[PDB]
């Protein structure tokens, strides 16, 4: 129903392999790979505000689903794309050669980013306030 919440990272797979494939420096990969931080989502209808803790970087993006928006990526690049809401619990987008799926089931968000044969998966649990 609503994506709003603070989410603490529980586990992830292929962080290092994904970040190397997009060109992050090895120095930032090593600094960030063990951080299990908190990301925040605020949903207002079709409007989303994301404050994402990704490794050692915090990225703050905002978009309305179905509308073209400029979003900052891990590399600092701003890509123009459209995120769609599938059902009430799946956010889907593609940018560059990455497919991204954000799925909410109960209190668990699973984010799956696919690049070639690397599936980068993050599992985060809502903080029950």
Ligand X SMILES: CCCCCCCCCCCCCCCC(=O)O
Residue 126 structure tokens: 């809502």
The Cα–Cα gap between 72 and 42 comes to 17
Nearer CB in complex with ligand X: 43/111? 111
The nearest distance, CB 19 to ligand X, in angstroms, is 9
100 binds ligand X (CB under 6 A): yes
101 is a site residue for ligand X (CB under 6 A): no
Dihedral pair phi/psi, residue 27, rounded to 5°: -65, -45
Longest Cα separation, the chain: 39
73 binds, among a second copy, ligand X, none (CB under 5 to 8 A by kind): ligand X
Residue 46 binds which entry of ligand X, a second copy, none, with Cβ cut-offs from 5 to 8 Å by kind? none
Length of the chain: 129
Hey, what are 74's tokens?
Answer: 């891990």
Q: Is 63 in the site for ligand X (CB under 6 A)?
A: no
**Residue 54 Cβ vs ligand X, minimum distance, rounded to whole Å:** 4
* Residue 52 near ligand X by CB under 6 A: yes
Enumerate binding residues for a second copy (CB under 8 A).
6, 8, 31-32, 34-38, 40, 51, 53, 55-60, 127-129
- Please identify which residue in the block is written with the tokens 């586990």: 11
| Closest CB 69 distance from a second copy, rounded Å | 16
Structure tokens at 28: 């930032």
Contact with ligand X (CB under 6 A) among 74, 92, 101, 118: 74
Place of tokens 């703050």: 60
Q: Report whether 53 contacts 36 (CB < 8 A).
A: no
């Amino acid at each position: 129903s609503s994506f709003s919440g603070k989410y603490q990272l529980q586990s992830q797979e292929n962080f290092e392999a994904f970040m190397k494939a997009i060109g992050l420096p090895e120095e930032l990969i090593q600094k960030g790979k063990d951080i299990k931080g908190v990301s925040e989502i605020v949903q207002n209808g079709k409007h989303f505000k994301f404050t994402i803790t990704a490794g050692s970087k915090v990225i703050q993006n905002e978009f309305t689903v179905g509308e073209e928006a400029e979003m900052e990526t891990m590399t600092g690049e701003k890509v123009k794309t459209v995120v769609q809401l599938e059902g009430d619990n799946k956010l889907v987008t593609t940018f560059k050669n990455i497919k991204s799926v954000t799925e909410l089931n109960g209190d668990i968000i699973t984010n799956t980013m696919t690049l070639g044969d690397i599936v980068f998966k993050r599992i985060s649990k809502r903080i029950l306030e």
